Structure formats: structure tokens, C-alpha cells
Amino acid sequence: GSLTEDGLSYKEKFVVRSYEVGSNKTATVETIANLLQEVGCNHAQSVGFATTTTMRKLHLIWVTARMHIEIYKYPAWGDVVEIEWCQSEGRIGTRRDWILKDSVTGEVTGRATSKWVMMNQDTRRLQKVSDDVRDEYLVFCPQEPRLAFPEENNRSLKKIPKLEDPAQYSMIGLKPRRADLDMNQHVNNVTYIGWVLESIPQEIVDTHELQVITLDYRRECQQDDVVDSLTTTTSNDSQFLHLLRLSGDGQEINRGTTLWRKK
Amino acid sequence: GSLTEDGLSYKEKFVVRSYEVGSNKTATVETIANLLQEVGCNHAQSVGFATTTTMRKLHLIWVTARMHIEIYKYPAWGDVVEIETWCQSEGRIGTRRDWILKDSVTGEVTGRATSKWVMMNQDTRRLQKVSDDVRDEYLVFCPQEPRLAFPEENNRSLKKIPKLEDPAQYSMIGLKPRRADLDMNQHVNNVTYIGWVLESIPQEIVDTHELQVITLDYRRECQQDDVVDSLTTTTSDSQFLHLLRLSGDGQEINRGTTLWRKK
């Protein structure tokens, strides 16, 4: 992987692995999401980091509030996928975008965008971005807007409602194992995507392909918490409303939507 | 990756990823096990496959009976690990696949693994002896003289494992596979069982020790709709005896042993 000529974006190639594919012999959405986080980490490392010097002084971290992924073609086992930046969104937080391409044809096969908010590591209290922090990362971002999802009214910015009981489908008693934890023993963001998809019926997975997924992150699941995954059909295309909540008290951890197209 | 000059073994390099490491910022044993299966698949493809032509017509497959892994140093996040793999004939009992893991920079051996494979009819699940016809079709891809990752006359890779007796000292109950735990044929990945075994090791052992050796016997497959209980008892460096069984009837699926060294 490497930063581009202007040093304002990062590119990396990945060869799709045997254990990374589903029944279609193409990468799962969870493998794509893992590759997006890997290229994001490599971009932060290449530019000097993604906590800045002022963030470490105040015990502040970047946390994901929303993830949005759109896939036109899932790369097959053995294929090479090329993934390509960050932007300041004022005092609200930051945004990270990705473009996925087939290495052989050069065509865009997917795109993703994510919203990040500033949070104190210890109290877990959200806050706005200060000017000192904002100026420290602006030298690594394009100055003009560069959007993976430019369109006037697009799916990446839609407000998601809260699923009402009873859910049409459900998967109960989901728990993270050590492989679901990151280097700081926190549940990996990609695990929640997998948990959301656990309540989609197998017949939908067998006859449709996942085109879009939008996930809001409200609260972290601790490695000792238990999760329930709920889904209701809202709709050639199928749409679903999703809700992840703590098995006991029913505390919301995530809400999302998926859009699937017939194979 | 590529076959070596004699075409009797295969080598591949991997750069350790951010999501592949544990709290010590080094690859987990599950990431190593995934890399071993990936290099094993690439070796089979490079030599024309690991189901042969007579196996395909007879509805015959290779299944893992035992996996044995020994790690001296886990590669750190961003390091390059080189893995060499080869296969060997073990008469009519079955096949063996061995691996050697090395640090790419120093060239030193950082780990080694061996696995026993048996012939099974894909449909009835009935074990079989290999027989002359299938042996002759894959002997042209194996070294003729013995090449062993674990040569020592009387080593840990060939030890008989006893069955854990109730009550277990430690346990993790209600473990279930999700879609990310399934391979391209919707079967639970072999690496998932390693993770399930490790779920019953207390966190204090993981925090103060490093996993040096793991030996796992595969007796029966977990179906994606089955529920598993993971049991562990200290037998001692620390040693543990392990048992995975179906949550309902208590049917054995796996048995194993782990050896850990103080950090």
C-alpha cells in the first residue's frame, strides 16, 4: 500500500482469500468491511499516526457513529481488489470514505463512507471537535470536498427509525468470542455487521445479494454482554429494518437497514 | 505465493493485519491457523486441484482428523511471515500436511504445524482407508523421502488425548456459529473450533501467558444450527485438557490439549 502522489489519499491491493468467501465464492460483506478498516489503519500509520498529539493529551478518541457500504460486485476468491481518504466535517466530527475497484478492469465495484465522532476514552462522553484538533488533521485531508457518495439525496445520509416489537425475524443470545475483539479488547465494528445479518433468513441470502448496508452505532457491546438481533421486511428488491439490543434490559446498541437485489 | 524449484512444496508471504492481532499486538493462533489453511489451498491450486479425479467420481473428500500447532514467536502487526507447506502419504491411513513458519526478515523458524487427514464419503460421512489408485494420483506432488515438521521420535503431535471428566474446572456454554464462521460450502471452518476451545481458558491465563502448543482432535462436525459447550481443566508452564460437546445430548465434537508459557 502507498499514499498517492499528492499525499492526500491512500491505496492498497488485496488478494481475496479462501476463508474470506461465502457460498458464491465471492468475498462476504464482513471481509470487505475488515479490508476497509485495514486500509484505514495503514493510511493513518503512513501519515504519522489515528489520535493526534492534542487528542492524546486530553484522553480523546475517534469512534464510529455510522458505517454505509454499497457493493455492485463482490470480488471472487483469488481476485485482486484495489481500495482507495478522510475529510473534516466541521465541529461535528470526521468522515472516512472508500472506493473499491477491480484491479484488472479498473472499474468501481463498491463504495463506502463512515461518520466519526470525538469521545473521551474514560467517561465515554461525546464532544465537538476543537479548532486545535481540527487544524492538526486538515493537513492530511483534501481541502475541496471529495465524496464517495456525492448525489443530492443519497442512502448514506438517511435517518433510520427504531424497529417496533414484534420483529418479523430474530437471532437470540449472540455473544462475542476472543476473535471478535480488537487489540484493545473492544468488540470489532465488523462483528456488529455480522450480528445484524444473523437475523436475515437463509432463503434471502441464498437468492439475493446484499447491495447496501447502513449501520448506526449507539453503544458498545462489552465482551460479557449478550445480544439479540431483530429484522423486519419494509419492502425484485428487498429491504429490511434492523435492531441489535442487549438481551437482558433491551438496551439499544445498533440500528440499521439493508437492501438486497435478486440474483 | 509459489511452488519451490522441485515443485514438491509451496511458499507464501503474509503481512500481518490490524484486525488479525490480539492485545499484545501479535497475530492470534486463529489468524495463524487461517494463514495455514490459505497457503494449503493455494498449494492445491498450484498443482492442479485437494480432491483428485478418482475421488470426485467416488464422492470422496479429505477431512481433518487432527491439527497440531507450535508457536515460538507470534508475528507482530505489520510484520511479514513466510509459510512453507507440503503434503505426504501416510499409507492407507490417510494424508498429512505440514507447515513451517518463518520471520521473513531474520529467516528464523518462528512456528511449525502438522495435520492428519482421512478419507470420507461426502454423502454418508463414512470413513475409509485410501487404497492404491488415489495414492498413486497424489504421490507425484509429495516428497518421496519423509519430510517432517515434527521429526523427534516421541513428540507432542502424536500423543493420545484423554476424555475430560465432569465436572470441568472452567466452561463457556451456548457457543453458536454465525455466517462468518462458515466456509464456501456452508460447513463450520476448522479454525472456529480452535476459537471455541480457547473460550473456556480464563482471561487471567491469556493475560499472563502465551499459547505455545495446541493439539486438536476433530471427531464430529458442528452444524450451523447446533449449540456447543467448551470445557477446560488444568492438568499441570500451564497445561489444560479440553472438550467441546453438543449443548443438548452432550455428544463429543472435539477434544484437545494446550500448553502455555509465562510471559
Ligand SMILES: CN1CCN(C(=O)c2ccc(F)c(F)c2)CC1
Ligand atoms: C469501538 N467502538 C467505536 C464506536 N462504537 C460504538 O458503539 C459507539 C459508542 C458510543 C458512541 F457515542 C458512538 F457514536 C458509537 C462501536 C465500537
Ligand SMILES: CN1CCN(C(=O)c2ccc(F)c(F)c2)CC1
Ligand atoms: C469439515 N471439517 C470440519 C471438522 N471436521 C470434523 O469435525 C470431523 C467430522 C467427522 C470425522 F470423522 C472427522 F474425522 C472430523 C472435518 C473437517
